[PDB]
Amino acid sequence: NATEIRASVGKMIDGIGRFYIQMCTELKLSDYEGRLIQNSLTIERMVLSAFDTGGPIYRRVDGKWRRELILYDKEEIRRIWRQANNGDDATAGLTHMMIWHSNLNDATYQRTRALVRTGMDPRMCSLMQGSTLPRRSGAAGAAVKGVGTMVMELIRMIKRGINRRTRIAYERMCNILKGKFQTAAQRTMVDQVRESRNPGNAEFEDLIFLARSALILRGSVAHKSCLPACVYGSAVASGYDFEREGYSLVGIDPFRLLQNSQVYSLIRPNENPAHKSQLVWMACHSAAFEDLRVSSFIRGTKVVPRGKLSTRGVQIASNENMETMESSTLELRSRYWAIRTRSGGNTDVSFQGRGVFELSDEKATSPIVPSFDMSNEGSYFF
């Protein structure tokens, strides 16, 4: 059923587009200045804040880049937003940029300070997918969460308590948790945890176990290809009418869109452009914990590890100066594409028979199997 699912999500994409365009028209930005992932970000956050303000806005004058610090009527923003979505709320839409931010953060940063202070092993990176993602996120917002993500929550919810309505949360938070697991025991053991009203160290210690079980017997976690507002704004402006032509977040749609995107980014004096593009690209598909081998395979070019990556973050801090600042064009194109999955595999070869698709292969017709016998460069982005 390609009617609701493909076209209803198109309608949520149209909203973000339309809105971004309107909002650019207010700031009186240029074309080059609307394609600046920097400005796009600021706008996206202005909105999520207002639906739950001001921000950094970079301008282009003869030669150099000027940063403007601006503020907007928190309600005006909310007004312009609905205008774009037909006076609807389109929580989906806000939630979408809620993820784009997530997926960018799960790749720009490593959240160790928090894992340990919770009592999780820092080496449990690959399980913290969406730890940044506000609880306000929707139902299809939590499905993107890693097993480890859930644990850090319950453990804190439990840790402060064990140190009214709060109960329905805990059980559900576990049901979700449990719905991540895809094996008998895994599934059953989650229940044995959900049994205690005041679950103390008994649970505290047990879930941590299950956290580690997922390192081997992974769960089902959905991945959503969520592109920056500018990319959708630009697309909408170019005529693409997604609600009518359909769109996906786990199909070929997102890759294809990024095959024509003209996104620019601010880049510090000593940073490596190629390295910058890599980052953004990995946030566009939630590939921050993917096997570097495969990421590079599909990417088309080396996908260098975080340590060897030359960049500190895409957003520009108030500390820095503009004099020594310039901007590059982000390389977001990829070689092939792949069905962003949810499954963690089980039996060691996973996704037996599943392959990669050419960017011409619109339909999921002919699959391609990668052979990794090769001089690779690692598997752990972190």
């Binding site: 690959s126 993917e290 392959g355």
Partner: peptide, 19 residues
């Protein structure tokens, strides 16, 4: 250490999953 130990899979392909 302080590094990764397993790989979270993002795509559907024939891939030995590292841990």
């Amino acid at each position: 250490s302080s590094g990764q130990i397993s790989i979270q899979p993002t795509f559907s392909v024939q891939r030995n999953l590292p841990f």
